[PDB]
Design an enzyme around this catalytic site. Structure first.
Site, PDB file in Angstrom:
ATOM      1  N   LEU A 195       1.886   4.114  -3.349  1.00  0.00           N
ATOM      2  CA  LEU A 195       0.993   3.317  -2.486  1.00  0.00           C
ATOM      3  C   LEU A 195      -0.397   3.975  -2.229  1.00  0.00           C
ATOM      4  CD1 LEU A 195       3.673   2.119   0.103  1.00  0.00           C
ATOM      5  CD2 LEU A 195       2.499   0.709  -1.502  1.00  0.00           C
ATOM      6  N   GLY A 196      -0.450   5.304  -2.126  1.00  0.00           N
ATOM      7  CA  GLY A 196      -1.727   6.063  -2.005  1.00  0.00           C
ATOM      8  C   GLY A 196      -1.445   7.573  -2.029  1.00  0.00           C
TER       9      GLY A 196
ATOM     10  N   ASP B  55      -7.112  11.025  14.363  1.00  0.00           N
ATOM     11  CA  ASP B  55      -7.712  10.409  13.205  1.00  0.00           C
ATOM     12  C   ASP B  55      -7.651   8.874  13.264  1.00  0.00           C
ATOM     13  OD1 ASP B  55      -9.146  10.413  10.850  1.00  0.00           O
ATOM     14  OD2 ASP B  55      -7.374  10.993   9.672  1.00  0.00           O
TER      15      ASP B  55
ATOM     16  N   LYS C 236       6.959   9.202   2.122  1.00  0.00           N
ATOM     17  CA  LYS C 236       5.817  10.087   2.144  1.00  0.00           C
ATOM     18  C   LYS C 236       6.187  11.527   1.854  1.00  0.00           C
ATOM     19  CE  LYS C 236       2.070  11.580   5.251  1.00  0.00           C
ATOM     20  NZ  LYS C 236       1.251  11.079   6.418  1.00  0.00           N
TER      21      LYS C 236
ATOM     22  N   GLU D  59       8.840   3.406   8.315  1.00  0.00           N
ATOM     23  CA  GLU D  59       8.976   1.965   8.230  1.00  0.00           C
ATOM     24  C   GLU D  59       7.880   1.359   7.364  1.00  0.00           C
ATOM     25  OE1 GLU D  59       7.537   0.803  12.699  1.00  0.00           O
ATOM     26  OE2 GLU D  59       9.440  -0.081  12.028  1.00  0.00           O
TER      27      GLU D  59
ATOM     28  N   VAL E  54       3.351   9.366  -0.807  1.00  0.00           N
ATOM     29  CA  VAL E  54       3.591   7.919  -0.391  1.00  0.00           C
ATOM     30  C   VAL E  54       3.918   6.792  -1.384  1.00  0.00           C
ATOM     31  CG1 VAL E  54       3.366   6.517   1.697  1.00  0.00           C
ATOM     32  CG2 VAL E  54       1.720   8.309   1.288  1.00  0.00           C
TER      33      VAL E  54
ATOM     34  N   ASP F 216      -3.969  -2.615   4.957  1.00  0.00           N
ATOM     35  CA  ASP F 216      -4.605  -1.715   5.897  1.00  0.00           C
ATOM     36  C   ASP F 216      -5.970  -2.276   6.319  1.00  0.00           C
ATOM     37  OD1 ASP F 216      -6.870  -0.568   4.596  1.00  0.00           O
ATOM     38  OD2 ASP F 216      -5.545   0.881   3.616  1.00  0.00           O
TER      39      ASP F 216
HETATM   40  O1  LIG Z   1       1.563   8.285   7.161  1.00  0.00           O
HETATM   41  C1  LIG Z   1       0.848   8.000   6.184  1.00  0.00           C
HETATM   42  N1  LIG Z   1      -0.070   8.815   5.627  1.00  0.00           N
HETATM   43  C2  LIG Z   1      -0.676   8.165   4.583  1.00  0.00           C
HETATM   44  N2  LIG Z   1      -1.619   8.688   3.780  1.00  0.00           N
HETATM   45  C3  LIG Z   1      -2.020  10.088   3.836  1.00  0.00           C
HETATM   46  C4  LIG Z   1      -0.993  10.913   3.119  1.00  0.00           C
HETATM   47  C5  LIG Z   1       0.004  10.608   2.221  1.00  0.00           C
HETATM   48  C6  LIG Z   1       0.748  11.732   1.796  1.00  0.00           C
HETATM   49  C7  LIG Z   1       0.336  12.938   2.373  1.00  0.00           C
HETATM   50  S1  LIG Z   1      -0.984  12.607   3.442  1.00  0.00           S
HETATM   51  S2  LIG Z   1      -0.083   6.578   4.283  1.00  0.00           S
HETATM   52  C8  LIG Z   1       1.075   6.703   5.589  1.00  0.00           C
HETATM   53  C9  LIG Z   1       2.073   5.783   6.130  1.00  0.00           C
HETATM   54  C10 LIG Z   1       2.365   4.465   5.599  1.00  0.00           C
HETATM   55  C11 LIG Z   1       3.462   3.830   6.146  1.00  0.00           C
HETATM   56  C12 LIG Z   1       3.818   2.581   5.726  1.00  0.00           C
HETATM   57  C13 LIG Z   1       3.080   1.954   4.747  1.00  0.00           C
HETATM   58  N3  LIG Z   1       3.403   0.702   4.290  1.00  0.00           N
HETATM   59  C14 LIG Z   1       2.648   0.084   3.335  1.00  0.00           C
HETATM   60  C15 LIG Z   1       1.518   0.694   2.769  1.00  0.00           C
HETATM   61  C16 LIG Z   1       1.140   1.989   3.190  1.00  0.00           C
HETATM   62  C17 LIG Z   1       1.910   2.648   4.167  1.00  0.00           C
HETATM   63  C18 LIG Z   1       1.588   3.899   4.625  1.00  0.00           C
END
Ligand SMILES: O=C1N=C(NCc2cccs2)S/C1=C\c1ccc2ncccc2c1
Length: 266
Positions: A11-12, A128, A30, A82, A15, A89
């Site tokens: 997803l990014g 953040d 994650k 979850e 993650v 986003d």
């Molecule tokens: O907690 C999260 N941190 C995110 N990006 C920064 C990093 C990723 C790995 C190390 S630092 S994304 C994220 C939580 C999250 C939770 C549910 C989701 N559902 C759909 C799409 C994206 C999502 C991201």
């Protein structure tokens, strides 16, 4: 384990999308590298601060992404979060739709305020707050705060570390490397509200942050401009409290999330 979740695509940044095999609940998986972890905490056992913070807030109220489980591995921890579906986003949502109508920005901004209050109330400071750390459940019209990776235990004394996003950080940070949690959060929220209603953040450079003048690039009502300028006061102690923000006239008559989704999202 490897066998308790099926695992889909990235997803990014870290993650992946997953389905919990017990009930195929949608989840987000994650991964965080131990070498990349700045701050650690403990349980009853050494973990990323992130997990401490998530457990402290991951208690029912749906304004925050809930941590469902975690594992430790040789060089990383893995966090089961979850995952609403469909979802988008706030940074992508703004990039596509452009500046949001005030009514919609009001509903969103209110929900963010409820979620930040919840964190603070659970003794956690996010550090953040910004569009990329806000998920929109597009069916229910509900926003969720994510990524507690720059967060800290909330306290009343001064913070001398920050590793959130600079263009959302306040002037006191930029000039002194000092801030107080709440007041800096309020500032990040002023940045976020400008973003919602103007379609982009108001300051790119340190000196713009320090100068604090706000130029509106879109048509924005007088009450909304006042609220924003207020959250962006230069003296920390001139910024409003969470309560003053939510009693501001621009914040009256907020839509429910469901209404919000029907009018603006479906
Ligand atoms: O907690 C999260 N941190 C995110 N990006 C920064 C990093 C990723 C790995 C190390 S630092 S994304 C994220 C939580 C999250 C939770 C549910 C989701 N559902 C759909 C799409 C994206 C999502 C991201």
């Amino acid at each position: 384990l490897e066998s308790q979740y099926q695992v889909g695509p990235l997803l990014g940044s870290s993650v992946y999308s997953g389905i919990r095999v017990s009930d195929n609940l949608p989840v987000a998986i994650k991964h965080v590298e131990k070498d990349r972890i700045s701050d650690w905490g403990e349980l009853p056992t050494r973990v990323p601060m992130e997990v401490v913070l998530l457990k402290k807030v991951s208690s029912g109220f749906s304004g925050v992404i809930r941590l469902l489980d975690w594992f430790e591995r040789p060089d990383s921890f893995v966090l089961i979060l979850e995952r609403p579906e469909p979802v988008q986003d706030l940074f992508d949502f703004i990039t596509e739709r452009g500046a949001l109508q005030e009514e919609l920005a009001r509903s969103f901004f209110w929900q963010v305020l409820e979620a930040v209050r919840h964190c603070h109330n659970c003794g956690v400071l996010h550090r953040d707050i910004k569009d990329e750390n806000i998920l929109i459940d597009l069916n229910r019209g509900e926003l969720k705060l994510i990524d507690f990776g720059s967060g800290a235990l909330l306290k009343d004394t001064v913070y001398t570390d920050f590793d959130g996003t600079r263009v959302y950080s306040p002037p006191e940070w930029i000039r002194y490397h000092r801030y107080h949690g709440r007041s800096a959060a309020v500032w990040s929220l002023g940045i976020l509200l400008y973003d919602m209603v103007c379609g982009d953040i108001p300051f790119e450079h340190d000196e713009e942050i320090i100068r604090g003048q706000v130029f509106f690039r879109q048509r924005v009502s007088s009450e909304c401009q006042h609220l924003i300028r207020w959250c962006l006061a230069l003296r920390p102690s001139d910024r409003p409290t969470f309560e003053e923000i939510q009693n501001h006239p621009w914040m009256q008559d907020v839509l429910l999330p469901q209404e919000t989704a029907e009018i603006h999202l479906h």
